[PDB]
């Protein structure tokens, strides 16, 4: 991208639109590191990951607004399947 924020935002988007299924991949780790406040500011050392994840990788931690969005999406998608199940050809 043209700047540091544009390239990082575009990377975040590419990772969420990148479909890998059949194996275990490391997208969750890549998606969280690039959005880390130290990475965006640049306070990165060669031992960065060892201090951020001293007990291993755990996954992205959701905040209040993100949990509400995930619950709203999961619930709406659940209902979307339930409504599609009711649309039959006319007998």
């Amino acid at each position: 991208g043209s700047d540091r924020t544009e390239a990082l935002k575009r990377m975040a988007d590419a990772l969420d639109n990148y479909v890998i299924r059949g194996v275990t991949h490391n997208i969750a780790l890549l998606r969280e590191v690039i959005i880390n406040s130290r990475f965006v500011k640049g306070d990165i050392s060669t031992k960065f990951l060892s201090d951020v994840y001293p007990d291993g990788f755990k996954g992205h931690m959701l905040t209040k607004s993100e949990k509400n969005q995930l619950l709203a999406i999961a619930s709406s998608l659940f209902v979307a399947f339930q409504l599609r199940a009711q649309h039959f050809q006319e007998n």
Partner: protein, 507 residues
């Protein structure tokens, strides 16, 4: 007391059933009651209960006492809808006299079966009983006879689905044998004729309840139950989704439902599943999942006769049945158990106008005395017949091997098939090149040259295709689109067959 007050008290008693303490036991036991199960099964507010005020008429052995007068007489019967589609149900209530079958008990079940046949609606039974009500004697035997007569009469007219969610003993065990699919609940349901007490009294063998008639036995070893689910709530949730596949009557076409999965997309994942090495197995399920709409596949008997796969799926919105070999298990060979499961599934789908898709990869039959003494000849004829009799669209894809008589058994084009496709790795022959050359070229010099010549000419899909055995040889990536096209043009296909009083399958 006024008439209206009496009625209200009769309604409250029927809703309670066998009493709160017996309900408490059912919940302690991790089971739902018969009325709670219906509320989960049917669309909210769609259930209409019939004959809620019926009581037994037996006056013997103290049965005339008011303390034994339970309205509803141990069954909940009525009608409703699942996703707007009419269904008739009944569920046996264990809290009243142990769920035992009385004369009136059977009656109420028979009446809703008669309506379901009259209008063309499916019947789902939720079974839980201890057997006949011996206090009435022979009236419960007449009850069984009337139910059995309806279950046979309804066959091929409406689908009949049975889910066993508790114990089942005595004559009750034969109704799931007359219906089309039987499901169970793991470690909660049992299905046996006599209990362990009789077995130990007759023969000097020790057995417990879970070993004699448990869900694990019937889904893994006897081949009676089509699938067991973890608990009551999950069992009914999966049952609703299963229901959505089936037509309401055999007079109806296979259901077609809104579908977002494009019918003309390619599946590149198929081109490299089948190995070039003839002794390397692969998982047929990867092919099935990649072809079917939105990769949803309903597998039947996952743990019984693993060398053959049968189940339901949808392609372009239309329900289809899928049958195929599993080369991962016993090289994909046919045996007694696989023939039994296949013939039963195929026969149901044909009766209710559900197209068949066959994925063939079968090197022959399982050899040995275990199969010969078991009547492999008799049982193998069951699958051959089940396909040959079919009048619904049949689309066959041959992925790798089809040797010997198994070629025709697995729905070859010569059994009135509609289309038959081969993948580039398909090989159709009486036997493999090694056996054929040793028999054809016996006592001749330079056999090794004859072996090379035979393999180059016959070890491929061409000697069959050039004869009209195969309609095209297709790239695997195009399989889904090719099948979708055939299904959307064969759906209106009708054939004529001579008149028969009834079929005579080899059994």
């Amino acid at each position: 007391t006024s008439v209206n007050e009496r009625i209200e008290n009769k309604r409250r008693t029927a809703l309670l059933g066998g009493g709160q303490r017996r309900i408490d036991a059912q919940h302690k036991r991790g089971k739902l009651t018969a009325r709670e199960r219906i509320s989960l099964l049917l669309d909210p507010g769609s259930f209409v209960e019939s004959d809620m005020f019926v009581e037994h008429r037996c006056a013997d052995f103290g049965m005339a006492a008011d303390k034994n007068k339970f309205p509803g007489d141990s069954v909940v019967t009525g009608r409703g809808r699942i996703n707007g589609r009419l269904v008739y149900v009944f569920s046996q209530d264990f809290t009243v006299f142990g769920g035992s079958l009385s004369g009136a008990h059977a009656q109420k079940i028979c009446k809703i079966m008669d309506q379901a046949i009259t209008v063309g609606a499916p019947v789902i039974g939720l079974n839980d009983s201890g057997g006949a009500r011996i206090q009435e004697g022979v009236e419960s035997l007449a009850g069984y006879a009337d139910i059995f007569l309806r279950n046979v009469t309804a066959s091929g007219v409406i689908p009949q689905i049975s889910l066993i969610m508790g114990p089942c003993a005595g004559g009750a065990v034969y109704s799931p044998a007359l219906t089309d699919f039987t499901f169970m609940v793991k470690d909660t349901s049992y299905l046996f004729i006599t209990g362990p007490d009789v077995v130990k009294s007759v023969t000097n063998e020790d057995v417990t309840q879970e070993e004699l008639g448990g869900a694990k036995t019937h889904t893994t070893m006897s081949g009676v139950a089509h699938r067991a689910f973890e608990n009551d709530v999950d069992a009914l949730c999966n049952l609703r989704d299963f229901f959505n596949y089936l037509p309401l009557s055999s007079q109806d076409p296979a259901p077609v439902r809104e579908c977002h999965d494009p019918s003309d997309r390619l599946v590149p994942e198929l081109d490299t599943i089948v190995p070039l090495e003839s002794t390397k197995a692969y998982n047929m399920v990867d092919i099935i999942h990649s072809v079917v709409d939105e990769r949803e596949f309903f597998e039947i008997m996952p743990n019984y006769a693993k060398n053959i796969i049968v189940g339901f799926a949808r392609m372009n919105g239309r329900t289809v049945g899928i049958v195929g070999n599993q080369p991962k298990v016993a090289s994909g060979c046919l045996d007694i158990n696989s023939s039994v499961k296949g013939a039963r599934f195929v026969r149901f789908c044909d009766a209710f106008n559900i197209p068949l898709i066959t994925f063939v990869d079968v090197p022959g039959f399982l050899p040995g005395t275990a199969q010969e003494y078991g009547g492999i000849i008799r049982h193998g004829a069951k699958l051959l017949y089940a396909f040959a009799e079919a009048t619904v669209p049949k689309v066959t894809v041959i992925t790798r091997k089809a040797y010997g008589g198994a070629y025709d058994v697995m729905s070859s084009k010569h059994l009135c098939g509609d289309t038959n496709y081969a993948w580039p790795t398909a090989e159709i022959a009486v036997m493999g090149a090694k056996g054929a050359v040793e028999i054809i070229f016996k006592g001749h010099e330079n056999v090794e040259a004859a072996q090379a010549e035979y393999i180059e000419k016959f070890a491929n899909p061409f000697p069959a295709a050039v004869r009209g055995f195969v309609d095209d040889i297709i790239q695997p990536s195009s399989t889904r689109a090719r099948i979708c096209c055939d299904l959307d043009v064969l759906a209106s296909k009708k054939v004529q067959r001579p008149w028969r009083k009834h079929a005579n399958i080899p059994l």
